[PDB]
Amino acid sequence: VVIGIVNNTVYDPLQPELDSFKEELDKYFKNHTSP
Amino acid sequence: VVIGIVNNTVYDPLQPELDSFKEELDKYFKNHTSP
Amino acid sequence: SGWTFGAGAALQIPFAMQMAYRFNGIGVTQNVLYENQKLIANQFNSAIG
């Protein structure tokens, strides 16, 4: 509805916080579920 | 102490960060605690 | 109606609620008013005496 809008991606700031923890947690799950 | 207050449930903006990711963590954990 | 009747239609606000708005513009949060409602009324009512 808004005129003149442009295309890009809104970089989530919650993303690096979870990502850094998912660099731990998602790694931990692959560290703990695999054995 | 506040006069005229009312009862209702408040939503944390981090419930979509917890209630929607604790469930994913629960979803992983159920897949993780099953073996 | 507070002050909205100086710009058009008049809209009603509780008087206790209105005083919070005035403190908001001063620079102090609205929460402090409700935590000290009783003494302010005594302070204000005796002031006009």
Ligand SMILES: *[C@@H]1O[C@H](CO)[C@@H](O[C@@H]2O[C@H](CO)[C@@H](O[C@@H]3O[C@H](CO)[C@@H](O)[C@H](O)[C@@H]3O)[C@H](O)[C@H]2NC(C)=O)[C@H](O)[C@H]1NC(C)=O
């Ligand atoms: C909003 O919800 C809360 C939680 O349900 C309500 O708090 C509870 O209110 C009841 C009565 O309104 C309290 O029972 C009272 O307990 C005292 C003992 O402390 C007793 O002497 C009274 O006769 C009465 O049975 C209950 O304790 C209280 N819960 C807590 C944890 O304090 C609240 O009343 C609700 N407010 C509104 C406006 O709906």
Ligand SMILES: *[C@@H]1O[C@H](CO)[C@@H](O[C@@H]2O[C@H](CO)[C@@H](O)[C@H](O)[C@H]2NC(C)=O)[C@H](O)[C@H]1NC(C)=O
């Ligand atoms: C901005 O990107 C969206 C895609 O998210 C574009 O929307 C598509 O537009 C094409 C035609 O331009 C359609 O065929 C697609 O069906 C559209 N997809 C969606 C999901 O909307 C949009 O055109 C782009 N706008 C600009 C100005 O680049």
Ligand SMILES: *[C@@H]1O[C@H](CO)[C@@H](O)[C@H](O)[C@H]1NC(C)=O
């Ligand atoms: C990976 O899992 C092991 C247990 O299997 C644990 O001792 C170790 O601390 C984990 N790795 C990290 C980086 O915490």
Ligand SMILES: *[C@@H]1O[C@H](CO)[C@@H](O)[C@H](O)[C@H]1NC(C)=O
């Ligand atoms: C659940 O565990 C199985 C077992 O390896 C795996 O194949 C599957 O991808 C897992 N799914 C999720 C959502 O974790």
